[PDB]
Write an enzyme that holds these catalytic residues in place. Structure first.
Site, PDB file in Angstrom:
ATOM      1  N   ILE A 176       0.830  -1.195   0.000  1.00 36.14           N
ATOM      2  CA  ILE A 176       0.000   0.000   0.000  1.00 36.14           C
ATOM      3  C   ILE A 176       0.864   1.243   0.000  1.00 36.14           C
ATOM      4  CG2 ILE A 176      -1.722   1.289   1.244  1.00 36.14           C
ATOM      5  CD1 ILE A 176      -2.465  -1.603   0.025  1.00 36.14           C
ATOM      6  N   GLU A 177       0.759   2.017  -1.055  1.00 33.61           N
ATOM      7  CA  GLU A 177       1.708   3.090  -1.317  1.00 33.61           C
ATOM      8  C   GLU A 177       1.008   4.427  -1.171  1.00 33.61           C
ATOM      9  OE1 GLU A 177       5.573   3.437  -1.824  1.00 33.61           O
ATOM     10  OE2 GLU A 177       4.973   1.701  -2.847  1.00 33.61           O
ATOM     11  N   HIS A 178      -0.292   4.431  -1.009  1.00 35.12           N
ATOM     12  CA  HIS A 178      -1.042   5.661  -0.840  1.00 35.12           C
ATOM     13  C   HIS A 178      -2.343   5.423  -0.106  1.00 35.12           C
ATOM     14  CE1 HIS A 178      -2.864   4.404  -4.784  1.00 35.12           C
ATOM     15  NE2 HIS A 178      -3.928   4.655  -4.067  1.00 35.12           N
TER      16      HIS A 178
END
Length: 272
Positions: A124-126
């Site tokens: 999960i990058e954002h």
């Protein structure tokens, strides 16, 4: 000695196949990325760089027969994914469980056919922590119901991770691979590993997981920054990291670039 390497697969149409990647013998874990569309009224979708999802069925079974664990990664570097409501978390936990983590029966119908995966990777990058704790609580509940599978995470190297730090603190992940790239605050740069060693010390001391893996790019082109050559990794990193109870091994971004650089072959001393 015996070193576990996790690798991401699925990032290019022309990459070495999943089955050949497992046949290399270099990897303990292959992480298929990404389920990168979910949330906010969207139906879930895979972006696996044009590979046929059904055609992966027999390749995953082959990997598993060679004792490679195969995980599906959710999120990714890019995509319209979000998990803002509690209903999204529930819906996604249920979808992943039926379609990937349980055997079929029937009407589902499974994107990877009758393969059952060995776990879910949170990349999960954002979107902040959102409802990712609730998603992990539910999946973790299913794990306690007899269906056994791993939960892993791929945070960025700044501690605590803005997206996942809250979830990592719950101790729900079996392993995490910290991305020691694309951020000069916490990755190798300019003939200088001090920022890296410091981030590593922090992660290996504070992260509530039994295994922490160091994630590196497999090639200078594979990431914006943080590439560290294999000889430097063995020389500089290993002696200190092997002194940690939590040292799990390394993660490589990614199979496409590792096929080109042979980074894992050098790290292992030409392993097949």
């Amino acid at each position: 000695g015996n070193l576990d390497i996790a690798v991401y697969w699925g990032q290019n149409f022309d990459e070495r196949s999943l089955e050949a990647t497992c046949d290399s013998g270099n990897y303990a874990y292959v992480i298929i990325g990404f389920l990168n569309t979910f949330g906010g009224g969207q139906t879930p979708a895979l972006d696996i760089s044009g590979h046929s999802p059904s055609g992966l069925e027999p390749q995953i079974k082959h990997c598993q027969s060679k004792n490679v664990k195969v995980l599906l990664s959710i999120g990714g570097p890019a995509g319209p994914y979000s998990l803002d409501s509690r209903s999204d978390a529930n819906d996604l936990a249920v979808y992943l469980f039926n379609n990937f983590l349980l055997p079929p029966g029937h009407s589902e119908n499974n994107p990877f056919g009758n393969a059952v995966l060995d776990g879910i990777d949170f990349h999960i990058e954002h979107g902040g922590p959102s409802q990712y704790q609730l998603l992990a609580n539910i999946l973790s509940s299913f794990r306690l119901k007899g269906t056994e599978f791993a939960l892993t995470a791929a945070p960025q190297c700044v501690y605590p991770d803005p997206n996942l730090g809250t979830v990592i603190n719950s101790a729900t992940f079996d392993a995490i691979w910290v991305q020691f790239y694309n951020n000069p605050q916490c990755s190798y740069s300019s003939g200088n590993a001090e920022a890296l060693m410091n981030a590593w010390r922090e992660w290996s001391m504070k992260a509530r997981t039994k295994k922490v893996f160091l994630g590196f790019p497999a090639h200078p082109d594979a990431a914006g920054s943080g590439y560290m050559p294999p000889a430097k990794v063995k020389f500089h990193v290993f002696p200190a990291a092997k002194k940690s109870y939590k040292f799990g091994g390394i993660m490589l971004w990614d199979s496409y670039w590792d096929t080109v650089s042979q980074f894992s072959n050098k790290i292992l001393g030409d392993g097949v």
